[PDB]
Amino acid sequence: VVACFRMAPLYNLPRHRAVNLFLQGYEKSWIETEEHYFEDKLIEDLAKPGAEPPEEDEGTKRVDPLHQLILLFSRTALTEKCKLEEDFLYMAYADIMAKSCHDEEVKSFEEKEMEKQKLLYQQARLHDRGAAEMVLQTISASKGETGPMVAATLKLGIAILNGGNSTVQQKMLDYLKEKKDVGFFQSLAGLMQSCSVLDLNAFER
Amino acid sequence: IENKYMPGLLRAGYYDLLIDIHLSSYATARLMMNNEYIVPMTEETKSITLFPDENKKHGLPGIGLSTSLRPRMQFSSPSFVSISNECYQYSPEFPLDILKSKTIQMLTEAVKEGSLHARDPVGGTTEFLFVPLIKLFYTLLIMGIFHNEDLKHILQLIEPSVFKEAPKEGLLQMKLPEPVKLQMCLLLQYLCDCQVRHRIEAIVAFSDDFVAKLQDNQRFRYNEVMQALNMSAALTARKTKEFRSPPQEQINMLLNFKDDKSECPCPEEIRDQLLDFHEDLMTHCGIEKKSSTLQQLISETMVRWAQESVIEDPELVRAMFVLLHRQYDGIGGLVRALPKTYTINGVSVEDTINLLASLGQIRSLLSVRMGKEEEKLMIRGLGDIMNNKVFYQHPNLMRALGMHETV
Numbered sequence A: 001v002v003a004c005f006r007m008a009p010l011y012n013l014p015r016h017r018a019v020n021l022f023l024q025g026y027e028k029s030w031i032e033t034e035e036h037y038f039e040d041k042l043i044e045d046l047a048k049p050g051a052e053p054p055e056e057d058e059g060t061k062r063v064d065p066l067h068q069l070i071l072l073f074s075r076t077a078l079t080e081k082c083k084l085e086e087d088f089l090y091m092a093y094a095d096i097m098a099k100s101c102h103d104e105e106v107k108s109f110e111e112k113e114m115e116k117q118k119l120l121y122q123q124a125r126l127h128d129r130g131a132a133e134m135v136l137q138t139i140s141a142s143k144g145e146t147g148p149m150v151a152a153t154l155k156l157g158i159a160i161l162n163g164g165n166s167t168v169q170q171k172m173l174d175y176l177k178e179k180k181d182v183g184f185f186q187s188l189a190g191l192m193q194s195c196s197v198l199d200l201n202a203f204e205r
Numbered sequence B: 001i002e003n004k005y006m007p008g009l010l011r012a013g014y015y016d017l018l019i020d021i022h023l024s025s026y027a028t029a030r031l032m033m034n035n036e037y038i039v040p041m042t043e044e045t046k047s048i049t050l051f052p053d054e055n056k057k058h059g060l061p062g063i064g065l066s067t068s069l070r071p072r073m074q075f076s077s078p079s080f081v082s083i084s085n086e087c088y089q090y091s092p093e094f095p096l097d098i099l100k101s102k103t104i105q106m107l108t109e110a111v112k113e114g115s116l117h118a119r120d121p122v123g124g125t126t127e128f129l130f131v132p133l134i135k136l137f138y139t140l141l142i143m144g145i146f147h148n149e150d151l152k153h154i155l156q157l158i159e160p161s162v163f164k165e166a167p168k169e170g171l172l173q174m175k176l177p178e179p180v181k182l183q184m185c186l187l188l189q190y191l192c193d194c195q196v197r198h199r200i201e202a203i204v205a206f207s208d209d210f211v212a213k214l215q216d217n218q219r220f221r222y223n224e225v226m227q228a229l230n231m232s233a234a235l236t237a238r239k240t241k242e243f244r245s246p247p248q249e250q251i252n253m254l255l256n257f258k259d260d261k262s263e264c265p266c267p268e269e270i271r272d273q274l275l276d277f278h279e280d281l282m283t284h285c286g287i288e289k290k291s292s293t294l295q296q297l298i299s300e301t302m303v304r305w306a307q308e309s310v311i312e313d314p315e316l317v318r319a320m321f322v323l324l325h326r327q328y329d330g331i332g333g334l335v336r337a338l339p340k341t342y343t344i345n346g347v348s349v350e351d352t353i354n355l356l357a358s359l360g361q362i363r364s365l366l367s368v369r370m371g372k373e374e375e376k377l378m379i380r381g382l383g384d385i386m387n388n389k390v391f392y393q394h395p396n397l398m399r400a401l402g403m404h405e406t407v
Helices: A015-031 A039-047 A065-078 A088-102 A109-127 A131-142 A148-161 A166-179 A183-194 A200-204 B008-021 B025-033 B043-047 B096-115 B126-143 B149-158 B178-228 B233-244 B247-254 B268-285 B294-308 B314-328 B330-340 B346-367 B372-387 B389-393 B395-400
Strands: B037-040 B341-344
Touching (some): A015 B247, A015 B330, A015 B341, A039 A065, A039 B294, A065 A109, A065 A131, A065 B294, A088 B314, A109 A131, A109 A148, A131 A183, B025 B346, B037 B178, B043 B178, B096 B126, B126 B149, B178 B314, B178 B330, B233 B247, B341 B346, B341 B395, B346 B389
C-alpha cells in the first residue's frame, strides 16, 4: 500500500526524467536485440580482388583488402610494446571474421558433406591470408594478460580451427617452429593461471 | 593562402599557422564535445524528424535543424596591446566569412585543375596542393561555420552524383595520394558523425510525445486499478506491482511489446507508434544502381581504394577499415551514442551551457603541463561546477560526461 507513495509511478515523474529513462530503456531493450547479419557478405566482398588484372598494374598479384587488414593486425601484434593495448578495430573485425567462419531436422550425408565443404571454404578465405599466424601473434603479444584482445583472438582461432582443420594446424605448427616463439607458450601458461574458478566468499557476499 | 607560386613547404606551414593562431581552440573544443548529446526540450527539438518529407530518402548530411547544445563561439580582439588576461583569453579574431568563401573558391578551382592532372600543381606536388587546403576545409567544417548552401556546394565538390539534389567527378574518385585520402576519410567520418547526431536528435524528438502518451495511459491504468481495488484485494497486489516497481523497471516492462510475449500493459496504438518509429530509424540507419546514400558511397569507396592500391601507410588502412565498419555497423553508433545522450528542460539550458563551458576548460587543460596559473584555472572551474545547480539536479548527466574521470 505504502510502496506506491514511497516511490511514485512514471506519471508523477517530470517530463525530462521520464524522457531520459525511456531513452535508456529503449536503447537496452531494442537496439541490441535488433541483429543484422552482414559478416559473410562483408568478408566475401573484402576477399574479392577488385579487377586487379584489368587494372593497369602490370605486376604481381596485389594483396586483397582482407589480406591487407590481416597484415596490419599482424604487424601491430609483432610491434614491440610493453602491453597489448586494446584495439576497437581488432575487437570488431576479429569478431566479424569469426562469425563469417562459424556461420551459425536430420541431415543427409550429402548435406553434411556440404556444410563441411562450406566451413572449409570459409576457413580457407581466412587462413590463406595469414589469420593462422595472426591469432598466434596476438596471443604471444598478450604476455598472459586476460582481456578482450585474447577473448576475441581465441574465438577467431576456434572459428578457423573448427572441425580440426589440418591445414591450419600445420600452418600454426610450422610458424611456431620457424619463429621459435617462446612468448606464445608463456602467454598460454599465464592465461591459464589467470583463469578464474568458483569463489565461495564472493558467492556468500 | 591564395598565392599559387608559394613553395609547398611554406604553403603547408602557413596553413598550419593560420589554424593554430586563429581557428584551433574552438575546433578542439567542439571535437572533444562531439560525442556528447545534450538535447533541450524545445519546440524546435520537437519539430525534428528522421526524414524531411513523406518519401524515405536521406537528406544531405549536415544541413537541417540541429538543437543539440554545442560550444559557443567567442573570439577576442586581435589587439594584444592591452595586458588584460581577460582579453588574452579566447582566440584572435579573423574574417571567418572571407576565409570560408576563399576556401570554397579554392577547392572548387583545385578540383578542376587537378582533374586534368597538370604537371604544375600549386606548391609543386598534388600533396602540397591538397593536404593543407583540405585540412583547412576540414577544420572549418568541424568548426561548423559552413551552413546551408555553402555546405551543399562543398558536398557537390566532394561528390556530385551522390549528393545531387533531386562528366564531372568529385574528390572521392580522383586518384588521390595517401595523405589526401586520410583527410578525405576524416571528412567522411565527420559526415557520419553528423548523421548519427541527427538520428539521436530525432529519437529525442519522438520521445517527447511517446513518453507523454505512455505516462497518460499508465496513469489512466492506475486510476482504473485504484477504483477497482475495492472489488478484489488479492488482485490489487499484482495490479500494483507495476506501479511499485522502480521507474527504470517500469520503463523496461512497458517497453517489452517487441516480439510477441506482450507482457506489458501497453495500448495497441502506443505499441504501433514505436513499432513504426523503430522501423523508420532502422531504414534511416540502413539496417533493413548508384549508391545514392553516404553509407553505400563510403562502403564502395573504401573497398575500391583498397582493391586499387596496396596502402603503405598503416594509419590510412586503419581509418578506412574503421569507417567501413562504422558504415556496416550503424546500430553500433546508436548503442554508443544513446548511453551518452541526455535530455534537459528548456529552463536549464543556460546553466547547462555554462557547466559545459567550465567542463570544456577543465578537460582541455588536461593536455598542458601542470602549473600555477593552471592550478588557479582548475580551482576556479571546479568552484563554478560546484556552484552550478545542474551539478546537483542531474547526477546522471555528470556521470555520463565522464567528469569524475577527468578530475
